[PDB]
Amino acid sequence: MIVVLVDPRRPTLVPVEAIEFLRGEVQYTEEMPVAVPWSLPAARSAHAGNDAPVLLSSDPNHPAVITRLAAGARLISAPDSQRGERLVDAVAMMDKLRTAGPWESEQTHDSLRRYLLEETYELLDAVRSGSVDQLREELGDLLLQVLFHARIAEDASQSPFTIDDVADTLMRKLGNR
Amino acid sequence: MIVVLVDPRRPTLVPVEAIEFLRGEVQYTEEMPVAVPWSLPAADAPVLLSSDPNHPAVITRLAAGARLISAPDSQRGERLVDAVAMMDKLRTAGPWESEQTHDSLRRYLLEETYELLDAVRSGSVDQLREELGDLLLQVLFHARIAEDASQSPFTIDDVADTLMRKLGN
Ligand SMILES: [Mg+2]
Ligand SMILES: [Mg+2]
């Protein structure tokens, strides 16, 4: 009857419109964090029992979600993700590979200064080649440099900063203009 | 009694741990969207709903022993989505930025990357962080220009996806 889709990057928060429908019998999909069944008193898994009048999930592709939606269940959904949230996914993967990476762990600002001027020229070649499918790839290569130098400046022993401070630096500079 | 503090960027989302408590009388602070009290069909109060940790009512009630049920803190990099939004506004409201193309931006790509190298071999952390934002701007600018493309547009999220697929291998 009702399908509740939450933000996958905040699967622990629910849309305010759904809380009355969340205190009864609900089913949660298997990718929901363990925090949800411990907060919802009378909830259970979507592979347990018969179908519940409301199913709580974060995966729009999950078969049960597609099932009940096709059968005319009403959807109560969290707002769509905002432009640039995969970027937050990106800095997390940069943080992960910085520690686990043998090479990536010992690299510093000077050991990266060599690569930067190369990747700029490859981006200039992409622009002049007119092909959209590698302007995008080299654009990623330049973003990788910005996230690497930023993750390194965290390990800074004097005046260390993060990717959130450079974003503040950029925004504060566009504001005086 | 209870303070429920929500993510200011995602103000209609409540922690699951607070569902039990938004049933009776509830108070909301001024910055909350008007839509939120309208969505709690079950409408001095024991429960205060807010998005502002520096609100006076939140501070006093927490200091008085109220229990806090808060949305998780922001992850490293959420300020990048603010930067994308500000890049989007200036692409549409700034006359000069509204005309820029991939070719016309080429000029300042080489200028700022050289300045970043100048900051690395200078030691200055305040200039390293500044020239990092200048280079970051170019990536957001080029990605935003791609969104307007008539042929095969992409966005900053797409280039973020492409970096990760390459990062996976
Ligand atoms: Mg390359
Ligand atoms: Mg500069």
From TrEMBL, chain A:
The EC number(s) attached to this protein equal 3.6.1.19, 3.6.1.8
Keyword set for this entry? Answer: Hydrolase
GO biological process, any: response to stress
Q: Which domain of life is it from?
A: Bacteria
Identify the enzyme class.
Answer: hydrolase
Which molecular function GO terms apply here?
A: ATP diphosphatase activity
Q: Where is the NTP pyrophosphohydrolase MazG-like domain?
A: 107-177
- Give the protein's recorded name: Nucleoside triphosphate pyrophosphohydrolase
Q: Tell me the gene name.
A: mazG
TrEMBL record, chain B:
- Keyword Protease included in the entry's annotation: no
Question: Quick check: keyword Hydrolase in the entry?
Answer: yes
Its Gene Ontology biological processes? dATP catabolic process; dGTP catabolic process; dTTP catabolic process; dUTP catabolic process; response to stress; TTP catabolic process; UTP catabolic process
Which UniProt key words apply to this protein? Hydrolase
Q: Specify the NTP pyrophosphohydrolase MazG-like domain's residue ranges.
A: 100-169
Q: Which GO terms describe its molecular function?
A: ATP diphosphatase activity
User: Hey, what's the signal peptide range on this chain?
Assistant: none
| UniProt-listed Enzyme Commission number(s) | 3.6.1.19, 3.6.1.8
Protein name stated in the entry: Nucleoside triphosphate pyrophosphohydrolase
